[PDB]
């Protein structure tokens, strides 16, 4: 069954969770090529592994910047979780290591670019296009949640398209293994559940709310709650009140009313029947879940490649040195990394 598959998945995950891989490469083993994305204390570069000629995405965090942002424990979470998972829509760690200045995490490279880029350019996705992506998010959450993992940063910016037009759910800076309830204020304003905004304890159900926002944004081309400033966005989120575009099909609207549900006792994903309330919703009726997992389904859009290590589906960022101090920084803070 699904249950059987997940039981084994847990066994695989827990072994790595309890005994994390550590120090499995060195910077000098990679040739850096291009910055693919940037972050607060971090950035991701395309690199080439010299021994194999394989291309990877290398996330580089500045240890001092992590400490100033109070993201030490969150960073340890990201690395510990990503070295332990394995799922077709996740990019597990191939390698990690650290040096005097930086932390490094090396993962599968998705050459298709961010969903964000294509969604913004094209404007919106058709319902079948939106559903193709949603399905993979549904499956990924089912996997993560069964591992007691909450993801906490669903948005198109983090959804990477691969060469076959399938999705990688990336950036686990806020992902956490937690049984029961947690309190940290984190995520992205447009995608925050009202629980988070109202500083309640919360759980995995916030990932299912964020799914509602995503599917809305994919199908409309804009989010259900937007404004110029985060406060105004939080006002809209807690108000209740979601307006749907006229072109939203009947089934879509119903699915979204059930994901974007402020009442936790009624929010899909969170009920007695779990993920199956979503999986068996009429909007997903044409979804062959096994075939999505297996990647047998034909992608509704497939990225325009013209080489391996081609980066035309990414924006251009200024290229910053990767500097390495002669002194070790923050050694204690990151001892287990």
């Amino acid at each position: 069954s699904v249950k059987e598959f997940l039981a084994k998945a847990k066994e695989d995950f827990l072994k790595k969770w309890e005994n994390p891989a550590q120090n499995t490469a060195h910077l000098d083993q990679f040739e850096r090529i291009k910055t693919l994305g940037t972050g607060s204390f971090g950035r991701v570069m395309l690199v080439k592994h010299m021994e194999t000629g394989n291309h990877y995405a290398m996330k580089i965090l500045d240890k001092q910047k992590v400490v100033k942002l109070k993201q030490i424990e969150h960073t340890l979470n990201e690395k510990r979780i990503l070295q332990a998972v394995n799922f077709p829509f996740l990019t597990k760690l191939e390698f990690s290591f650290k040096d005097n200045s930086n932390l490094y995490m090396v993962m599968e490279y998705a050459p298709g670019g961010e969903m964000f880029s294509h969604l913004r350019r094209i404007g919106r996705f058709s319902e079948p296009h939106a559903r193709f992506y949603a399905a993979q998010i549904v499956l990924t959450f089912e996997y993560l949640h069964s591992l007691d993992l909450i993801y906490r940063d669903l948005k198109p910016e983090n959804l990477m398209i691969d060469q076959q037009g399938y999705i990688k759910v990336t950036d686990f800076g806020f992902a956490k293994r937690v049984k029961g309830r947690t309190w940290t204020l984190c995520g992205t304003p447009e995608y925050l559940a009202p629980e988070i905004i109202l500083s309640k304890g919360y759980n995995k159900a916030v990932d299912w709310w964020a799914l509602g926002v995503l599917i809305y944004e994919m199908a409309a081309g804009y989010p259900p709650f937007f404004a110029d400033q985060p406060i105004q966005i939080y006002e809209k989120i807690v108000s209740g009140k979601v307006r749907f575009p006229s072109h939203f099909s009947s089934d879509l609207k119903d699915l979204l009313r059930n994901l974007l549900q402020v009442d936790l006792t009624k929010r899909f994903g969170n009920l007695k029947n779990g993920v199956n309330d979503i999986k068996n919703h009429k909007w997903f009726a044409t979804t062959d879940w096994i075939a999505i997992y297996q990647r047998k389904v034909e992608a509704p859009f497939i990225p325009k490649f013209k080489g391996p290590g081609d980066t035309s589906n990414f924006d251009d960022y200024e290229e910053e040195e990767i500097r390495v101090s002669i002194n070790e920084k923050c050694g204690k803070e990151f001892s287990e990394f």
Binding site: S40, D153, L185, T188, P189
Partner: peptide
């Protein structure tokens, strides 16, 4: 239109995480 209001907004580009 809501589309036009979105496109005119300051939040059509990449959106940063919040943290405290």
């Amino acid at each position: 239109t809501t589309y036009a209001d979105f496109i005119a907004s300051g939040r059509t580009g990449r959106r940063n995480a919040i943290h405290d």
